[PDB]
Each structure stands twice: as structure tokens, then as C-alpha cells.
Design a protein around this ligand. Structure first.
Ligand SMILES: CCCCCCCCCCCCCCCCCC(=O)OC[C@H](COP(=O)([O-])OCC(O)COP(=O)([O-])OC[C@@H](COC(=O)CCCCCCCCCCCCCCCCC)OC(=O)CCCCCCCCCCCCCCCCC)OC(=O)CCCCCCCCCCCCCCCCC
Ligand SMILES: CCCCCCCCCCCCCCCCCC(=O)OC[C@H](COP(=O)([O-])OCC[N+](C)(C)C)OC(=O)CCCCCCCCCCCCCCCCC
Ligand SMILES: CCCCCCCCCCCCCCCCCC(=O)OC[C@H](COP(=O)([O-])OCC[N+](C)(C)C)OC(=O)CCCCCCCCCCCCCCCCC
Ligand SMILES: CCCCCCCCCCCCCCCCCC(=O)OC[C@H](COP(=O)(O)OCCN)OC(=O)CCCCCCCCCCCCCCCCC
Ligand SMILES: CCCCCCCCCCCCCCCCCC(=O)OC[C@H](COP(=O)(O)OCCN)OC(=O)CCCCCCCCCCCCCCCCC
Ligand SMILES: CCCCCCCCCCCCCCCCCC(=O)OC[C@H](COP(=O)(O)OCCN)OC(=O)CCCCCCCCCCCCCCCCC
Ligand SMILES: CCCCCCCCCCCCCCCCCC(=O)OC[C@H](COP(=O)(O)OCCN)OC(=O)CCCCCCCCCCCCCCCCC
Ligand SMILES: CCCCCCCCCCCC(=O)OC[C@H](COP(=O)(O)OCC[N+](C)(C)C)OC(=O)CCCCCCCCCCC
Ligand code: SF4
Ligand code: SF4
Ligand SMILES: [Zn+2]
Lengths: 115, 45, 209, 115, 176, 49, 52, 95, 52, 96
């Protein structure tokens, strides 16, 4: 009970090192991604998007969940560096065609029934 | 009246060839070279 | 076995597989948890996840097993189990003209050792298991999605993944590219409740709760 | 002894000039490695049994073709390869120690089907 | 039993070596390949003159769907929904209500012909021979919407092809 | 000669379609000038051979 | 009923694309051999299990 | 089948076979497209007596797997007897 | 292959995706005269492989 | 029978028609509304009632195995005619 087999990191301190290593790889890659794919975004927008993705999981405290997130993040990086992804796949992080949905109670009330 | 299905003929079907069949044709190598050399000599003459 | 509509039993193979099942459990007691043979003569060895490399190596190399072919490797998702995933190895022995099934288990976070060292065929089967179920295989030469689209989020073959997914693609003329948007169906898939409220097979009746 | 076969019929499986002498070496090496496994391990008892049976046939049949009919393992070159695999397996069973008791029983309903 | 496909030892007598030498230098086995395609040039082609000629079909052919009537003109379909339950693609949508005369009939009978896999399971499951796959297969359209058949379109198909549909069922219903 | 019969059999396709005008009509509408046996004609004008 | 028919299994020697082409062409010949036996041994009776 | 004798000779010679014997285009040797109606037979279970379903119920004879071992000088065995070696074909051993 | 698609079409109604073989047997019995047509197709197919 | 609504659109045998203000009528502009003119409710009503001498009659729809499952209709009531639930043909017992 509570004794589990690890993936890569035996504790959060070790896991956070892999998070920082992954962040440095993504940070150095955005200039190349915005160049090869000929994206109409800036290097600042891309690096802001990377930061947005990392802060989205800043509340994790289980090292194994962090290990999978780094594993999944490295697969994403490998797909982008080798240009397995297309321009359509790299722009799906920006949701350019999705109309902004309401956030406040009143706006959600007027348009439909969803919470 | 009686059962009627799709069945083989009473005596069965005839033999069906399946084995490879590549018949031998042409002349021997000796004759082929003899004809070609004879053509040259007449051509040269 | 004279009944036209009923499948005849082969009790010679049933004894042979039962005998060999004990044989494996005697040689690998550290890993073998349960052995069984089905009524259609298929032997199953249920092992601890730690025994993936020892068990498969024995079954491939032992002179009385010689299971040189990995017929297939797949996972089954059973949410009600503490370990929801069930890794299934189907091996074939050409020397003895026999088949054996090796089964283990894991969950969302526990890795399972990669069997590429034992069977080169497991390279893509483990990529498919990871891609479609999210089961991580440790020490895999290169693990990544094999079937799903690039950037696809989630694991489709999990029982809690919806049939139509969460996103769908179209072409948008404003951005001049194919985009991904939340799924809306013109006709919703119609769920049919087909189960009959009367028990079909008394032989499999589970003890009352 | 018999005439030497020109081919085994299997691609990449070279003919063996001395099938008997090579088999006697491999089986003897297997029985030496099995001496390091505890006397009561079922792997040792079973593997020594079958190895001795094949070793006796190799010593009691000088003709290769007649030896193959007794070993029932295909070409004599296949039998040598299986001896090499068994020897490699025994060297690895020592490290794994499968004869030890079960590492851990499964949860209560892990192998219960249907659910 | 097995056989070898490429386990043969060539002869080494001087006449066999010369024969292979002539084949290498005079391209005999390539000239032989030319002779096989020359033969086809002088055979009658297998092409048919479509649309003036049609490829042969059979009474079991599974083509466009149709809803049939009894000889009196009453619809055969009685809204049992067996076709809807067995349709692998869920291409059939049905609604039903008691008709003005109290008859069990449908108010909606739609087949999305772009979901359908033309498998015939619906006509197998129909207990009144109401929904059938007809012999028509030349019904391509210039727009997607034209392939979403409703009840009116399916009754029109049945009334159009009934003469042929009835004769095909007459030719194959004893096998069913 | 079977050679002559071929040429003769090709000259009878012109006559079997009603002359040159009929022969050319079926050569350009259907790209085929075979002569067949009239099995029947439907109410829309289609003729089946 | 594959144990009631007679046919030969082609076997290659080189393991290359040419031996696998010969195996496939020779398997087509063996399929004609089986079809001959299925056309003559076809028995009468029902075509689906008589269990409704 | 409408080829003149000369063209038949030319195409038979160019291929080395007698093509006319085995033409790849079908002719009146095919079955008639209209056939007499069938009268198919019935299965072994079409009986009026001695035909209770519990005596031929295949699904209800299936059983759960029989547990051989569970964690909840004996001779060695293999999964089955070693496979007998195939015999070279006598129809055509070498292609 | 076109002629062997007619055998598919004459037993199931579809040239390719017959859905003919099912658990329990097949879906319908062979129509009368089919086996005669399979014999005629098979009698010549060996020559087709020889040309190949 | 086929009848037209006041705006001119035809009414189907199910009683479906678009109201004068429904925007969905735009789909029929430049095209036509497919309607089957052989209303089955009218055609079945045109069939004569069959007189029979027995209290119970069977209908398979005609054509044997090409009809519908054979059902048995009770003709004891004199006020109304027994109707086949499958094909709508009516039967009446002769002189009750
Ligand atoms: C090079 C020389 C070629 C010779 C011309 C071809 C020829 O006449 O072959 C006849 C004849 C037909 O051969 P086939 O393949 O058996 O024809 C199938 C049926 O028998 C016969 O087939 P069928 O039943 O269809 O016969 C009817 C057909 C037969 O029509 C013919 O007469 C054949 C075409 C000849 C013109 O009628 C037509 O379709 C006529 C319209 C098509 C004419 C197209 C060719 C026109 C010439 C183009 C060049 C113009 C300048 O071939 C021979 O017997 C040997 C020809 C070689 C020797 C020719 C010189 C001596
Ligand atoms: C007696 C006195 C002594 C001297 C007498 C000498 C007389 C004989 C003179 C020698 C004859 C040489 C003939 C030419 C040989 C050249 C070809 C060759 O090198 O063969 C080996 C080559 C290669 O053969 P290979 O692939 O098997 O390899 C040969 C070498 N080994 C085996 C060691 C690897 O063959 C070819 O050239 C293949 C041809 C390519 C395919 C072309 C399509 C075929 C077209 C056929 C129609 C041709 C119509 C031509 C006529 C046109 C008219 C305008
Ligand atoms: C169109 C009008 C019709 C006539 C058109 C000409 C058709 C010619 C091509 C078809 C030939 C028939 C096929 C055939 O018999 O070949 C098999 C035969 C036999 O094939 P083979 O490979 O089995 O050889 C058998 C004999 N051994 C093995 C000993 C060599 O091939 C030949 O013999 C052709 C030899 C001719 C060589 C010509 C090459 C030199 C060309 C010089 C310039 C001219
Ligand atoms: C390309 C054009 C060449 C076409 C050559 C024709 C081949 C041919 O006709 O051979 C087929 C014929 C088959 O008959 P047969 O030999 O009896 O078969 C049984 C044998 N076991 O057998 C024959 O009739 C043999 C006829 C061809 C003999 C070979 C011809 C000489 C080839 C070598 C010389 C090449 C140089 C010639 C110079 C050309 C100058 C114009
Ligand atoms: C007879 C036909 C005459 C017309 C042909 C004209 C074309 C000539 C080009 C083709 C070459 C054929 C001429 C060579 C001689 C052939 C006759 C011959 O060799 O004698 C027959 C004899 C029987 O052969 P066998 O005993 O069964 O086995 C061989 C064992 N040495 O074989 C022997 O045992 C004798 C020794 C055989 C070895 C001699 C070397 C032969 C190879 C040298 C290259 C020949 C080609 C050179 C020319 C190339 C240009 C074409
Ligand atoms: C460089 C080539 C020289 C010719 C080029 C110019 C061609 C004329 C094109 C402009 C005039 C239009 C002519 C109409 C096209 C010809 C085909 C045709 O339409 O046939 C129509 C006519 C039958 O009409 P009909 O059925 O009676 O009326 C309708 C009844 N419901 O049946 C007829 O055909 C009437 C006869 C006069 C028209 C004949 C067209 C001849 C076309 C060239 C014939 C070449 C044939 C040989 C081909 C080469 C073979 C080696
Ligand atoms: C060149 C001009 C065209 C050739 C002239 C027409 C050939 C003479 C008429 C004819 O067809 O008889 C030739 C005869 C073919 O008859 P055959 O097929 O062998 O036997 C009857 C089977 N029903 O036998 C022959 O075909 C003789 C071989 C043809 C002559 C050589 C042509 C080489 C080109
Ligand atoms: C411009 C003018 C060029 C003419 C060329 C003349 C060449 C003369 C040299 C001798 C040729 C020779 O010997 O060839 C004559 C040949 C040989 O036939 P065989 O002895 O019966 O066959 C011998 C045994 N086989 C049947 C196995 C081959 O016959 C032909 O079928 C040649 C037809 C061309
Ligand atoms: S043919 Fe098959 S897929 Fe199409 S509507 Fe009928 S049951 Fe559905
Ligand atoms: S078409 Fe046939 S199966 Fe479908 S609802 Fe109507 S009666 Fe039932
Ligand atoms: Zn009725």
C-alpha cells in the first residue's frame, strides 16, 4: 500500500529536473518551429504558448504523473523537430477558428443550458 | 418434389490442369550461333 | 461427438495443455499466479508484471517450449479492476504445433518492461498499446504514437474514451488550413440497450453479492 | 557417418561440419551451468532430464540422418541452435531465480472474468 | 506435403552451357516475352461498350433501396424497426404512430445513403419484404443532400422499380 | 478466302443499318457498328438488340 | 475441411523477393487444385447451423 | 471465337499455346441466366420427435476455464508431441 | 478477378464485401448453375498463370 | 389524397407541410418537393371487404412466403369488420 513502481523519477525534486530540461528544449525549439513551418506568429507568441502549457499542470505533486507528462511532452517535441507535424498540427494550440465562448454566468445563461 | 441443390454432375467434373506448363521452343545454341555467324559472313562479303 | 450442431471436444489436447500448464508453473513459481485451460483448449498463464521477461524468455528458449513466434500482443481495459489494463501475449510454437497465452496487468502509471529484447515483433505492438491505451513500456527502443493523429490527445481504446472523441476536423477558408474544433454530430449516435433481463448461461453464474 | 548435406533449407542457418562433436559440447556445458541452480529447482530437474536424454542419443547414433529422427528437432543444425538457446536460458535463470516463491499475489479480483 | 520452387541445379554439359550462352547473348527469353504480348494484340478485347452494354448482374444484387407495397397499394412496412436495430451503420431513422385508420405505419423512414454500407441486412431482417435493395446502381448525385433519402423518396423508388424488384424476389426467395 | 468474307462481312454492316447515313449515326452515337437482332423496342424509343 | 483436401505448400530457398514471388504463383496453382476437389466433394444439406 | 484461321495460327504461334482451346472470353458454355427454382433441403434438427433442444444445445455445454494452478520424479512434458516432419510432394517435388 | 467477382456477386449480391460467411455457416445456398460456372473458370485459369 | 396547403405546398401522406413563415421552404426554391402521390391509406380503403363463412380467418398477405406472417382474425363481432394488422385487408363473416 502506497509503495509503487516508479517510471523515471523517484521524487518530485528529481522529477522537476526533467520538467526544466524539457522546458529548455521547447524554449530553444520555438524559433526553429516558427521558421520551418512558416508560421505567421512571433517567437514570443510561441514561447508564451509553451509557458501556458507548462503552467497548466503546475499543481501536480505525483512524480509518476509528472514523468508521463514529460514523456508526452518529449513525444510532442520529437514530432515537431522532425516535421512529422504539419502547419495544421502546430496551430491547433492556438484555436484560431474557435469563437470565444462565454465565461460569466449571465453570458452562459443567454446562449444555452450548459453550466 | 425432391431436393434440388447446386451439386456436381453425376460423374463429377473433368480434370483441371494446374501444374506449370512452359513448352520448349526455338533451336539449340549451336544452330543459333551458326545462323548468326553465317549472316555476318554473307554481310561482310 | 455425434451431434451435428455441437462442437466436438478434443480431450487429448486438453490433458496435454493442462499438463504443460503445471510444468510452467513449477518452473516459474516466482511469477505464475494462475493457470487455466478453456473448454476449447487454449492455455492461459497469468503472471505477475515483474515476470514478463523471465516468463517469455523461458517460453521462447526452453527446449520443451520453443515458442519462437509472437502471434499478437494486445491490451484489454477493465475499469472495475484496480489494475484496469490486461496485457495479453499470444505465442506460437512451430516445433510443438501449440499455442499459449500469457497475461499480466498494470494501471495508468505503472510501467511494464518492454519485450523487444525477447521478441522483435513486440516493437510495434507495444507502440500500439501505448498509443491506444496509455500503458508505458520501459526501455522501449522508441515509444510514440503509431495509429493516432499527430498531437492527438487521449487514448481511444480506453472504455471511458467516447466513441466519437472530443475533436473533429474540417477545412477553414479564413486560415487556409485544416482546423480542429469540438465535436458536434448532425445525428447523435443512438445508444441501444440490447441486454436481455434473463440470464443466458447458468454455468457462468457468479455467486450472489 | 553419412554424406555431408549441401544445405539446411533454412536461410541463414549454415551447415555444421561436426554436428556430433558440437552437440556433445553444448549439452555438457548446459549440465555444468545447471549445477549452479539449487538441486530442488524444477528447472534444474527438468532441464537436466531432457538434456541427458538428448545427450544419450548423440552418443548412441553416429549417423546424422538417423540421429535427427531420434531427436525430432528438424535438421541437426536446428538442434544445435536450440542447444545454444537453452544454454543461454540457463545462464539467465540463475540471475532471475524463478524457483523463489511468488513475488506478490494479485488483487482480490484481478483474474475474475466476467466482471 | 511441400515442394521446392527454386531448388534446381543447372546442367553443365557443353550443349547446356552453350544453350544458356545463346540465351544470354541473343535475348531468347526476352524475345519470348515479346511473343506473348503480340498474341494478346490479336485477341478480341474484353471491353464492353458502356453505357450501351452493361456488366452482368444477378437477382441477389444489392443496389438502391426501395420501399415496397402490397398488390393492393398498401405499404408493406409496419414500423417494426427491425431494420433500424440491425443496420450496422445506423443509417436508418424511423418514427411511427397509429395512422388515421389505426394502422401501424411510419411517419419517418430515412436512410442516410452516405452512412449505409449496402449490406442487405435490412432486407434480411424485414418480416414483410418491405425494405429491399433494388437492382439500380446508377444514382450518382451532384450534391450531398440528395443522398439523404426520406420516406417519400423511398416510396417513389419502390413504385419506380417494383416491376423489376418483384421479378428478382420471385427468382431468389426460395434460397431465402 | 476467309479474308474476303471479313471484308464482305464489314460491308454488310453498312446495309444492316440502312445505308451510310444510318451507319454513321450508330458509329458516332454508340462508337459501335455491329448489327444485331431486334429483341424489342420500349415506349421511350430505346431499341434492344 | 482443409484436412480433407490435398495440396502442396511451396517452400523457398533464398528468402528473397524472387522466391516469395514463386511461392505466390505456385500457391495460385495449388488453389486451382483445391477448387477441383471442392467442386467434386461438395455434399448436400443445409448451409447454416440448424440451431435457431 | 470470330478470328480467322490465319490470325488464330499467328496468335497460337506467338504464344506457344493453343489459345482457342481455352479462351478467356466466355461464350454459350456459361449457365443460363434463368434457372429452375430450387427446393433446398432441411437440417438435421427438422424433426417432429426426439428433438428436444436441451440435447443439442451447444452454447449451454460451454464451461468456464478449468483452473490448473492458482495462488489464491515427475517427467518433463511439452505442449504437445513434436510436429512430424513434412514429406516431399510426389505430385511435383521440384518446380 | 472480374469473373471471380461475379461468383461473389452471384452468391451474396456484392462484388467485394459479400458478408456471406457468418458464424454458423453461410448466408444463402449457392444458386443453381454456379458450380458449373466455377468449373469453366477454373478449367482455363492455369493457362492464365502460364502467360503470367 | 394529395392536397395543397394555402401557400401552395403539397401535403404528404404523413400530414407534413411547411407553414407560410417557415424559412425551411427556401430549400424548394428552384427545385421540387418530393411527394408520393399514391396514399396508402386511400388505396387500402378501396379494396372490397371479403365475405367468409367461418368465425376465424387467416391472412398471409397473399403470395405465400412473399407476403407477411400468417395471422388469424376473429370475426365474431358484427358491428365492425376484422382487419389484418399487417396488410389492412378486411374480412366479414357471412350472415353472422
Ligand atoms: C497491315 C494490313 C492490315 C490489313 C487490314 C486488316 C484486315 O483486313 O484484317 C482482316 C482479317 C481479320 O482478322 P481477325 O482478327 O480474325 O478479325 C476478326 C473477325 O474475323 C472479323 O471481325 P468482324 O466480325 O468485326 O468483321 C467486321 C469488320 C471487319 O472489317 C474489316 O474488314 C477489317 C479491317 C480491314 C479494313 O467490319 C468493320 O468493323 C469495318 C470497320 C472497321 C475498319 C477499321 C480499319 C479500317 C482501315 C484503316 C486504314 C484506313 C487507311 O485479318 C486477316 O485475315 C489477316 C490480315 C493480314 C493480311 C492482310 C493483307 C493480306
Ligand atoms: C566463330 C568466330 C568467333 C567470333 C564470332 C562471334 C559472333 C557472335 C557475336 C556476339 C553476339 C553478341 C550479340 C549482342 C550481345 C549484346 C547483348 C548482351 O550483352 O547480353 C547480355 C545482357 C545482360 O545479360 P545478363 O543480365 O544475364 O548478365 C550478363 C553478365 N552476367 C551474367 C555475368 C551478369 O543482356 C541484355 O543486353 C539485356 C537486354 C535489355 C532488354 C532490352 C529489351 C529486349 C529487346 C529485344 C528486341 C531486340 C531487337 C534488336 C534489333 C533491332 C533492329 C533495329
Ligand atoms: C507483327 C507481325 C507478326 C510477326 C512479328 C514478329 C514477331 C517476332 C516475335 C515473336 C517471336 C515468337 C516467340 C518465340 O518463339 O521465341 C521463343 C524462342 C525460344 O525461346 P527460349 O528462351 O526457350 O530458347 C530456346 C532454345 N535455347 C534455350 C537453347 C536457346 O526464342 C528464339 O529463339 C528467338 C531467337 C531470335 C533471336 C533474335 C535476336 C537478334 C535480333 C537481330 C536483329 C533482328
Ligand atoms: C525479333 C525477331 C526474331 C524472331 C525469331 C523467331 C523465333 C522462332 O520462330 O522460333 C520459334 C520456332 C518454334 O518451333 P520449334 O523450334 O520447332 O519448337 C520446338 C523446339 N524444341 O522455332 C523456329 O522456327 C526457329 C526460328 C528462329 C531460329 C533462330 C534465328 C537465328 C537467330 C540468331 C541470329 C541472330 C542474327 C540474325 C541476323 C538478322 C539479320 C536480318
Ligand atoms: C558443333 C557446332 C559447330 C558450329 C557452332 C558455331 C558457333 C560457335 C560458337 C559457340 C561455341 C560452340 C563451338 C565450341 C565447340 C562445341 C563442340 C564441343 O565442344 O564438343 C562437344 C563436347 C561435348 O561436350 P561434353 O563432353 O558433354 O561436356 C563438356 C566437357 N568439356 O564438348 C567437349 O567436351 C569439348 C571441350 C569443351 C570445352 C571447349 C571450350 C568451349 C568453350 C570455349 C568458348 C567457345 C565460344 C567462343 C566463341 C565466342 C563467340 C560466339
Ligand atoms: C476532317 C474530316 C472531314 C469531316 C469533318 C467535318 C464533319 C462535319 C461536322 C460538321 C457538321 C455536323 C455533322 C453531324 C456530325 C456527323 C455525325 C452525325 O451527327 O450523324 C448524324 C446523321 C444522322 O442524323 P439523323 O439520325 O437522321 O437525325 C436525327 C434523327 N433523330 O448521320 C450522318 O452522319 C449524316 C451524314 C453526313 C455527316 C457525316 C459526318 C462525316 C464525318 C467524317 C466521317 C469519317 C468516317 C471515317 C473515319 C476514318 C476511318 C478510317
Ligand atoms: C501475310 C498476308 C496474310 C496471310 C495470308 C492469309 C493466310 C492464308 C489463309 C489461311 O488462313 O490459311 C493459313 C493456314 C492457317 O490455317 P490453320 O489455323 O493452321 O488451320 C485451320 C484451323 N482452323 O496456315 C497458315 O497460317 C500458314 C502460316 C502463315 C504464313 C506465314 C505468315 C508469316 C507472317
Ligand atoms: C543473308 C543470308 C543469311 C543466311 C544464313 C545462313 C547460315 C548458314 C550457316 C549454317 C546455319 C545452320 O546450320 O542453320 C540451320 C539450322 C539447323 O537446323 P537443324 O540442323 O535441323 O537443327 C539442329 C538441331 N536443333 C533442331 C536442336 C537446332 O536450321 C534452321 O532451322 C535455321 C533456320 C534459319
Ligand atoms: S444495406 Fe446494411 S447499412 Fe445499408 S441501410 Fe440496410 S442494413 Fe443499413
Ligand atoms: S422496413 Fe421492414 S424491418 Fe424496417 S421497420 Fe418497416 S417492416 Fe420493419
Ligand atoms: Zn394480411
Amino acid at each position: 500500500s502506497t509503495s509503487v513502481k516508479p517510471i523515471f523519477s523517484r521524487d518530485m525534486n528529481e522529477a522537476k529536473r526533467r520538467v526544466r530540461e524539457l522546458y529548455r528544449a521547447w524554449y530553444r525549439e520555438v524559433p526553429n518551429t516558427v521558421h520551418l513551418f512558416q508560421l505567421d506568429i512571433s517567437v514570443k507568441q510561441g514561447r508564451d504558448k509553451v509557458r501556458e502549457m507548462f503552467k497548466k499542470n503546475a499543481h501536480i505533486t505525483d512524480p509518476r504523473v509528472v514523468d508521463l507528462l514529460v514523456i508526452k511532452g518529449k513525444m510532442e517535441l520529437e514530432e515537431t523537430i522532425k516535421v512529422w507535424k504539419q502547419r495544421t498540427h502546430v496551430m491547433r494550440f492556438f484555436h484560431e477558428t474557435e469563437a470565444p465562448r462565454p465565461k460569466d454566468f449571465l453570458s452562459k445563461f443567454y446562449v444555452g443550458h450548459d453550466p | 418434389s425432391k431436393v434440388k441443390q447446386d451439386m456436381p454432375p453425376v460423374g463429377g467434373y473433368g480434370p483441371i490442369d494446374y501444374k506449370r506448363n512452359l513448352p520448349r521452343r526455338g533451336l539449340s545454341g549451336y544452330s543459333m550461333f551458326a545462323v548468326g555467324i553465317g549472316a555476318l559472313l554473307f554481310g561482310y562479303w | 461427438d455425434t451431434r451435428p450442431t455441437v462442437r466436438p471436444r478434443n480431450d487429448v489436447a486438453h490433458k496435454q495443455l493442462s499438463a504443460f500448464g503445471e510444468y510452467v508453473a513449477e518452473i516459474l513459481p516466482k511469477y505464475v499466479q494462475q493457470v487455466q485451460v478453456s473448454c476449447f483448449n487454449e492455455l492461459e498463464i497469468c503472471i505477475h508484471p515483474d515476470g514478463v521477461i523471465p516468463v517469455l524468455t523461458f517460453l521462447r528458449d526452453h527446449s520443451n517450449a520453443q515458442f519462437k513466434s509472437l502471434a499478437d500482443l494486445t491490451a484489454v481495459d477493465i475499469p472495475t479492476r484496480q489494475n484496469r489494463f490486461e496485457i495479453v501475449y499470444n505465442l506460437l510454437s512451430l516445433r510443438f504445433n501449440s499455442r499459449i497465452r500469457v497475461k499480466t496487468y498494470t494501471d495508468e502509471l505503472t510501467p511494464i518492461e518492454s519485450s523487444v529484447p525477447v521478441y522483435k515483433a513486440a516493437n510495434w505492438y507495444e507502440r500500439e498499446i501505448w498509443d491506444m491505451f496509455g500503458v508505458f513500456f520501459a526501455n522501449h527502443p522508441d515509444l510514440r504514437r503509431i495509429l493516432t493523429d499527430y498531437g492527438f490527445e487521449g487514448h481511444p481504446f480506453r472504455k471511458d474514451f467516447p466513441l466519437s472523441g472530443y475533436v473533429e476536423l474540417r477545412y477553414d477558408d479564413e486560415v487556409k488550413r485544416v482546423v480542429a474544433e469540438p465535436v458536434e454530430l448532425a445525428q447523435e449516435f443512438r445508444k441501444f440497450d440490447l441486454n436481455s433481463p434473463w440470464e443466458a448461461f447458468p454455468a457462468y453464474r457468479q455467486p450472489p453479492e | 557417418a553419412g554424406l555431408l548435406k549441401k544445405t539446411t533449407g533454412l536461410v541463414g542457418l549454415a551447415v555444421c561440419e561436426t554436428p556430433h562433436e558440437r552437440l556433445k559440447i553444448l549439452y555438457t556445458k548446459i549440465l555444468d551451468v545447471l549445477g549452479h541452480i539449487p538441486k530442488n529447482a524444477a528447472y534444474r530437474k527438468y532441464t537436466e532430464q531432457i538434456t541427458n536424454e538428448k545427450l544419450s542419443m548423440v552418443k548412441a547414433e553416429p549417423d546424422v540422418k538417423k540421429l535427427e529422427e531420434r531427436l525430432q528437432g528438424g535438421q541437426i543444425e536446428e538442434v544445435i541452435l536450440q542447444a545454444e538457446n537453452e544454454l543461454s536460458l540457463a545462464r539467465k535463470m540463475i540471475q532471475w531465480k524463478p524457483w523463489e516463491p511468488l513475488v506478490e499475489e494479485p488483487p482480490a479480483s484481478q483474474w475474475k472474468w466476467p466482471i | 506435403t511441400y515442394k521446392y520452387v527454386n531448388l534446381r541445379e543447372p546442367s553443365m554439359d557443353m550443349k547446356s552451357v552453350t544453350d544458356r550462352a545463346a540465351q544470354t547473348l541473343l535475348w531468347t527469353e526476352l524475345i519470348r516475352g515479346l511473343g506473348m504480348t503480340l498474341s494478346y494484340l490479336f485477341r478480341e478485347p474484353a471491353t464492353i461498350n458502356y453505357p450501351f452494354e452493361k456488366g452482368p448482374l444477378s437477382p441477389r444484387f444489392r443496389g438502391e433501396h426501395a420501399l415496397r407495397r402490397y398488390p393492393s397499394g398498401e405499404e408493406r412496412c409496419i414500423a417494426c424497426k427491425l431494420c433500424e436495430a440491425v443496420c450496422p451503420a445506423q443509417a436508418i431513422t424511423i418514427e411511427a404512430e397509429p395512422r388515421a385508420d389505426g394502422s401501424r405505419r411510419t411517419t419517418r423512414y430515412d436512410i442516410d445513403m452516405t452512412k449505409c454500407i449496402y449490406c442487405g441486412f435490412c432486407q434480411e431482417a424485414c418480416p414483410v419484404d418491405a425494405i429491399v435493395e433494388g437492382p439500380n446502381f446508377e444514382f450518382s448525385t451532384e450534391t450531398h443532400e440528395e443522398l439523404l433519402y426520406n420516406k417519400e423518396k423511398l416510396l417513389n423508388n419502390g413504385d419506380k422499380w417494383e416491376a423489376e424488384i418483384a421479378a428478382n424476389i420471385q427468382a431468389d426467395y426460395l434460397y431465402r | 478466302m476467309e479474308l474476303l468474307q471479313v471484308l464482305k462481312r464489314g460491308l454488310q454492316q453498312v446495309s444492316g443499318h440502312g445505308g451510310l447515313r444510318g451507319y454513321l449515326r450508330v458509329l458516332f452515337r454508340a462508337n459501335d457498328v455491329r448489327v444485331g437482332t431486334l429483341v424489342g423496342e420500349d415506349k421511350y424509343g430505346n431499341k434492344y438488340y | 475441411v482443409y484436412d480433407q483436401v490435398e495440396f502442396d505448400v511451396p517452400i523457398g530457398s533464398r528468402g528473397d523477393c524472387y522466391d516469395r514471388y514463386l511461392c505466390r504463383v505456385e500457391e495460385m496453382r495449388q488453389s486451382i487444385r483445391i477448387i477441383s476437389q471442392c467442386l467434386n466433394k461438395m455434399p448436400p444439406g443445409e448451409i447454416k447451423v440448424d440451431d435457431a | 471465337a470470330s478470328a480467322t484461321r490465319f490470325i488464330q495460327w499467328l496468335r497460337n504461334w506467338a504464344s506457344g499455346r493453343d489459345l482457342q482451346a481455352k479462351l478467356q472470353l466466355r461464350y454459350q458454355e456459361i449457365s443460363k441466366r434463368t434457372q429452375p427454382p430450387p427446393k433446398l433441403p432441411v437440417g438435421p434438427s427438422h424433426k417432429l420427435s426426439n428433438n428436444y433442444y436441451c440435447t443439442r444445445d451447444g452454447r449451454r455445454e460451454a464451461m468456464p476455464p478449468s483452473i490448473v494452478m492458482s495462488s489464491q520424479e515427475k517427467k518433463a512434458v511439452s505442449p504437445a508431441p513434436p510436429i512430424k516432419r513434412w514429406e516431399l510432394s510426389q505430385d511435383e517435388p521440384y518446380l | 478477378r472480374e469473373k471471380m467477382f461475379e461468383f461473389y456477386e452471384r452468391v451474396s449480391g456484392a462484388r467485394m464485401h459479400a458478408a456471406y460467411v457468418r458464424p454458423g455457416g453461410v448466408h444463402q445456398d449457392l444458386p443453381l448453375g454456379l458450380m458449373d460456372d466455377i468449373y469453366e473458370f477454373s478449367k482455363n485459369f492455369s493457362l492464365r498463370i502460364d502467360e503470367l | 389524397g394529395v392536397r395543397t396547403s394555402p401557400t401552395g405546398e403539397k401535403v404528404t401522406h404523413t400530414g407534413q407541410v411547411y407553414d407560410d413563415g417557415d424559412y425551411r421552404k427556401v430549400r424548394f426554391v428552384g427545385r421540387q418537393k418530393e411527394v408520393n402521390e399514391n396514399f396508402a391509406i386511400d388505396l387500402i380503403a378501396e379494396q372490397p371487404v371479403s365475405q367468409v363463412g367461418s368465425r376465424v380467418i387467416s391472412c398471409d398477405g397473399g403470395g405465400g412466403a412473399l407476403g407477411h406472417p400468417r395471422v388469424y382474425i376473429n370475426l365474431d363481432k358484427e358491428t365492425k369488420t376484422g382487419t389484418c394488422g399487417y396488410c389492412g385487408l378486411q374480412f366479414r363473416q357471412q350472415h353472422h
